Design a protein around this ligand. Structure first.
Ligand code: DCP
Ligand code: MG
Ligand code: MG
Length: 516
DNA sequence: GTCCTCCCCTC
DNA sequence: TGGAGGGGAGGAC
């Protein structure tokens, strides 16, 4: 009993086979996979260049992605192209594709940009908008590969996915009769006791698993195991599952590399939040694995603060630093040691801060009715044990077309509508591509126009768009756009308004119809 | 009841 | 940065 048995139960293991519940198991095996230098790799592949070519993706005068080759010269995202040229004589800057105002398609103008001397080879900010479609297209191809490999994939941003490897790990653990640990030892023989129990079917779901067999310690992790204290690699079933998951994840990443050409970095752990930190730890082309017994070593390595966690990077994180009196460094360890035993300790502390007459609820981002959830979230995050589910997203949720405007390039309603015509062409084209690619009817329901005046004042309007089929979709979007921009022009009467500094159209709500 | 506006989160 | 995109609160309707 107890230290004579695993820390984990049959329930926790069997849960890995449930897509709805696998994430809440302490045995969960989550991967976060992030494309290295994504937009720069897309341009590299498009132009038939190699990983040794110092490519940068350029948007107007800013570098928005830097190849690992260019990084060797000290080039950083948001360098200007001129600053980058001073660091690397052999630099290959490639401008994003663009739409020209007055046209209804996008294209690349290779050999063109602000760095080019020839005045015939400029891509003027007055006259063009960006197309990110080449990057979106490649993102969707990658998504298709991830979903072919794994039954639960969350697209987290244009170049990131989370994978729940629970079913793959479980199935391998229990059923894989071919996997070799050594030249003399198969996985099936190493795990003969647990497989016998499982097939025998005689276990109690609430009973602890047996201690791991010595023979499973021959199982190898694939990738970089984060382990500065030199802890034993395989000591319980979580380590077994994680090691199996590292083997599978390398195979998935190799499929991405072989089919599309892209290198990835990857984080492997029992939770999404730790995976995301681990994927960014080592780049390019690496997989960082964070064992449960190494979570505190990792979180406390000095790279991370509580604000490093998803949702805590902005004003709520800053409020929590003030409310919880967190230090400027080693805040994660501080949270852990100050409320060491349970989340109720932290909840009690929060409730007192919040119940004070002088706490301003109208400006706070803390919900005083939800302090139990906040306390548990902070308690578990500080220990690397906050498990969030993965969501499989619809084909699309929202779609935006945006132009930040310089000079007088939008100086009247005539100019606004000219830009709306580009937005409507772009959005309709994106919708048609999704319909073809996923065999759906994709129907915009709501549109929002947002703009900024010369004084940077925001004006916005949203409402319904009618549907008449794909062949009338651009027209239906433009009808609403024109309506909204003229309405806002009236609202701006006698106020600082033209020339605008920004105009955007967003389809904020879609209906998606499946076809047989 | 849902819709519109404004705001906060991320890459 | 610009140009995305995800998500939710709460008063308007
Ligand atoms: N503020 C940002 C951040 C990123 N991107 C784009 C360019 C990136 O290539 C892509 C993915 O973002 P990442 O943060 O993953 O950065 P990279 O993939 O470029 O580099 P890394 O190898 O560090 O992941 O999104 C952008 O347009 N604006
Ligand atoms: Mg990336
Ligand atoms: Mg990213």
């Amino acid at each position: 009993g107890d230290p004579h048995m695993s820390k984990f139960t049959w329930k926790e293991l069997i849960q890995l086979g449930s897509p709805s519940k696998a994430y809440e198991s302490s045995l969960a095996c989550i991967a976060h996979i992030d494309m290295n230098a994504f937009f720069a790799q897309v341009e590299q592949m498009r132009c038939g260049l190699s990983k040794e070519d110092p490519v940068v993706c350029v948007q107007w005068n800013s570098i928005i992605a830097v190849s690992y080759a260019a990084r060797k010269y000290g080039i950083s995202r948001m360098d200007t192209i001129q600053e980058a040229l001073k660091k690397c004589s052999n630099l290959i800057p490639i401008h994003t594709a663009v739409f020209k105002k007055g046209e209804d398609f996008w294209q690349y103008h290779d050999g063109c940009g602000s760095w080019v001397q020839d005045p015939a080879k400029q891509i003027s900010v007055e006259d063009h908008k960006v197309s990110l479609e080449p990057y979106r297209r490649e993102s969707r191809k990658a998504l298709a590969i991830f979903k072919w490999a794994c039954d639960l994939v969350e697209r987290a941003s244009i170049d990131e996915v989370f994978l729940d490897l629970g079913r793959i790990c479980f199935n391998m653990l229990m059923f894989d009769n071919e996997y070799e640990l050594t030249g003399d030892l198969k996985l099936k023989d190493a795990l003969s006791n647990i497989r016998e129990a499982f097939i025998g079917g005689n276990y109690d779901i609430n009973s602890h698993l047996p201690l791991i067999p010595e023979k499973i310690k021959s199982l190898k992790f694939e990738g970089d195991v984060f382990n500065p204290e030199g802890r034993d690699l395989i000591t319980d079933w979580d380590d077994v599952i994680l090691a199996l998951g590292s083997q599978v994840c390398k195979g998935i990443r190799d499929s991405i590399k072989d089919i599309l050409g892209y290198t990835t970095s990857c984080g492997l752990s029992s939770t999404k939040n730790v995976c995301k930190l681990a994927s960014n730890y080592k780049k390019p082309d690496a997989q960082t694995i964070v064992k449960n017994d190494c979570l505190l070593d990792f979180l406390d390595c000095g790279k991370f603060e509580i604000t490093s966690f998803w949702t805590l990077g902005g004003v709520l994180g800053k409020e929590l630093i003030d409310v919880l009196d967190l230090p400027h460094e080693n805040s994660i360890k501080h949270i852990r040691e100050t409320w060491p035993d349970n989340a109720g300790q932290l909840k009690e502390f929060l409730d007192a801060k919040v119940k004070q007459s002088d706490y301003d609820r109208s400006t706070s981002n803390i919900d005083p009715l939800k302090t139990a959830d906040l306390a548990e979230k902070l308690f578990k995050l500080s220990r690397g044990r906050y498990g969030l589910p993965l969501s499989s997203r619809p084909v699309v949720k929202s779609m935006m077309s945006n132009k930040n405007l310089r000079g007088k390039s939008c100086n009247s309603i005539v100019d606004c509508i000219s830009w709306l015509e580009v937005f409507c062409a772009e959005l309709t084209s994106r919708i048609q591509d999704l319909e073809q690619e996923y065999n759906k009817i994709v129907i915009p329901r709501t549109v929002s126009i947002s703009l900024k005046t010369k004084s940077y004042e925001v004006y916005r309007k949203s409402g319904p768009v009618a549907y008449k089929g794909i062949n009338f979709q651009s027209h239906e979007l433009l009808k609403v756009g024109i309506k909204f921009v003229t309405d806002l022009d009236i609202k701006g009467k006698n106020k600082s308004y033209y020339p605008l500094t920004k105009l955007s159209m967003t389809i904020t709500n879609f209906d998606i119809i499946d076809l047989q």
